[PDB]
């Protein structure tokens, strides 16, 4: 067993939202067996010192695209709305790859470097959606970032993404650029059979993530709906963004959510990205049908997109986890970072009832266990007897946090670094002292970096 | 001589916006020798390794108040109006200071943690305006801060502040703090004599600085503007925050601009603070008095108060420089960090308009030459011989910034923390390896912690 003794502060999520001061951890092999004070070092072979630490459940990315790692602080793409920046990301991949500069062993190593990131920001799991599969043939780029999660020891979910709809045909989106759809569902077939890990404490899950319903034809959201419910998966895809309604009325005469319940994602399955602008008499029934959101801060600033009403999803019962996005609208991986970002930024929207804004505490909560909910992951997002080991840790005893008075506030509100201090996924020590224990860094930085194109 | 050698960026701010790759700067004493390719080391002492780091001038923070960094955190102040924080916060510094817990002994300590901590997040020049002065006589509140500044190393300019106006004698400041107008000009007098370095490279300046429209009387703007004018100092305030405008009408019957330029205010030894909610019209007048503003985004958002319209002050040529202020509504010195806030948080403003919002060069010019001019300093701010060797690096190599394709954006859009890794502050070494080079920063934290209330 390993004990973590002393942590100043412990942040449980549980039930009854326990918190702990000068507590410990015991954990063994994948899971926790307590979270106490004074814990029994019985059958300990390794104590690892809390103090002056803060421990929460392992921050979860609901939301990524991992092979934007390779397209941060683009000039051209710094200033730019949704149409000119989907043209330029996808322009950018498909020549790259043209040239012999972006398949699946590059892609190893962007996924390599920014999992790694994810890790040292105290990210345990992350659920990566990847729908860059140029060619005649689905390419092994899923295989690439499974490969990479799986040596770096981070939890790992794989939405396999797509644009199936041209332009041709409503979608804003270049038939070079389109799949077809029995290609994408032969390929998510395969993928449950080879990798998916049903069982709690799995480090690898499959999940099935159109992009939306401006690039897919609605015959894959059904074709999902059915693989879904037969496989036991769940299905993620993005969700109210502000062009969208136009798009879903000029081809279908109804909204994207009227459109989602028609192809079977009106469901407790289903995960969705975004939300930032949805009619508010659809909040309730998204409520009722049981999705869950997504909050993605950081790009919906990026792109101009403004403020996702967080607050009455809330208020509706509603699950709201929290991601980063990929880091061509981001640009960094740094999920607790974009806590802050969201912590202030939705306070103008309500200048005179601050009781709206969102707290640190709800915040924090939605970064473990709202994502963890979101991917449909009870084991994970809270620290208690018999959830998964996924913890991480940052210090306290900065010079950046002299003056604080609630860790958990400060851990949003203060500080020069978002870089934690210890993380345990699943039970292994893999971040010490802000460095990695097992990752050979200086190699990783090297080797991807000799490959961005 | 020391020689900075082989940067991978060097970012001037000159006035041709140069930048460099692959060059170097030269130091001798205080100021900046060359800032090229393959400088001599003929005269050389030191060479410091610059491979991997991106070079611009040391960040300027235009507005602090170093005393709130005893008042991080606090859950109660956590979601608050104005009306709730000012209140808050003045009861809580009255208290602890009549409880004996809140001297110039604890202020220092508490100067000494922030200004640290700015040391290490690359600001090399802060300016405080100290808000607290309880009882009578003014105690050495700011000889405090100077000291803490002096032992560090760290460029400084302090504001001397007031509330002069009585909220009996029809006002809004307690009476406890509430200074006659010649008791606050002869302290200023008395601390220009003892501390103001008026040389280029001075290292301690003193600035007059009253609260603002709503908190201070005619006579000491009008005092102030003959001070600045003979002595050649420059004039702080705050500045149409959401509801001066108000007061101000139920005052003096006048805007807040009007009222500054009725007293004296409409000249070019003025910056102004946060400059949130001014009348557009009078956006014309602040550029014909050459009055400079100082950008605070980050409690613009905290306190819910929105987009001060900073596109429109650089469309009317007015100076913008940028600050974090104090840590009871950040709650960090961070500057670094709250570039990125600037740079997302102003673009749902325009949704379909990127050519407004700011770019990370014009955010990185805010906080460096855009600062240094709200300061009145032409020895700061720029990378170019003959300017301070006034000095900020980063790390460019690190995992959370592999994929950056331009080193100026990845350091405000990407990354796990904003420490620098090399700071210069008047030719003095201050920060390598992200470690104080002098300070003893363990000891710096455990002195201070202490002394919290
Ligand atoms: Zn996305
Ligand atoms: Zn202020």
Redesign the pocket.
Same mark, same amino acid.
């Given at each position: 067993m390993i004990l973590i003794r002393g942590l100043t502060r412990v942040i449980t999520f549980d039930d009854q939202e326990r918190e702990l001061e000068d507590a410990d951890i015991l954990i063994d092999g994948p899971k926790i067996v307590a979270v106490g004070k004074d814990l029994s070092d019985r059958s300990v072979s390794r104590t690892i010192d809390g103090r002056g630490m803060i421990a929460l459940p392992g921050l979860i990315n609901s /939301? %990524?695209?991992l092979y934007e790692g390779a397209m941060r602080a683009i000039p051209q793409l710094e200033r730019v709305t949704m149409a000119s920046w989907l043209e330029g990301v996808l322009t950018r991949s498909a020549g790259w790859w043209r040239d012999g500069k972006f398949g699946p062993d590059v892609i190893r190593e962007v996924a390599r470097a920014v999992l790694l990131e994810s890790l040292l920001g105290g990210i345990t799991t992350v659920a990566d %959606?990847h729908l860059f599969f140029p060619g005649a043939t689905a390419d092994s780029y899923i295989d690439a970032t499974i490969e990479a999660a799986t040596d770096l020891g981070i939890r790992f979910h794989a939405a396999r993404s797509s644009m199936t709809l041209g332009k041709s045909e409503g979608g804003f989106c270049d038939d070079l650029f389109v799949e077809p759809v029995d290609r994408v569902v032969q390929h998510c077939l395969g993928l449950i059979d080879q990798y998916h890990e049903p069982e709690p404490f799995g480090m690898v899950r499959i999940a099935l993530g159109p992009?939306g319903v401006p690039y897919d034809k609605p015959e894959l959201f059904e074709a999902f709906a059915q693989m879904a419910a037969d496989y036991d998966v769940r299905l993620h895809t /993005?969700f109210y963004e502000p062009l969208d309604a136009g798009m879903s009325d000029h081809l279908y005469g109804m909204t994207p959510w009227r459109f989602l319940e028609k192809h079977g994602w009106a469901s407790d399955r289903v995960w969705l990205? /975004?939300a930032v602008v949805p009619p508010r008499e659809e909040i309730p029934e998204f409520a009722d049908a049981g999705v869950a959101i997504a909050h993605?801060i950081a790009?919906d600033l990026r792109m101009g997109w403004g403020l996702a009403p967080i607050r009455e999803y809330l208020d509706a019962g509603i699950t709201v986890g929290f991601?980063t996005?990929?880091s061509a609208?981001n640009d960094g991986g740094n999920l607790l970072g974009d806590l802050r970002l969201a912590a202030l930024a939705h306070r103008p929207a309500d200048p005179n009832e601050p009781e709206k804004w969102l707290s640190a505490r709800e915040l924090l909560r939605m970064a473990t266990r709202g994502s963890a909910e979101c991917l449909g992951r009870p084991d994970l997002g809270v620290l208690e007897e018999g959830r998964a080991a996924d913890i991480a840790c940052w210090r306290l005893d900065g010079v950046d946090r002299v003056g604080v008075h609630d860790p958990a506030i400060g851990l949003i509100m203060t500080g020069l670094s978002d870089r934690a201090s210890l993380v345990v996924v699943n039970g292994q020590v893999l971040v010490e002292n802000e460095r990695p224990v097992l990752a050979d860094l200086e190699r990783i930085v090297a080797n991807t970096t000799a490959l961005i194109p």
């Open positions: /939301h %990524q695209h %959606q992009c /993005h990205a /975004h993605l790009p991601g996005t990929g609208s």
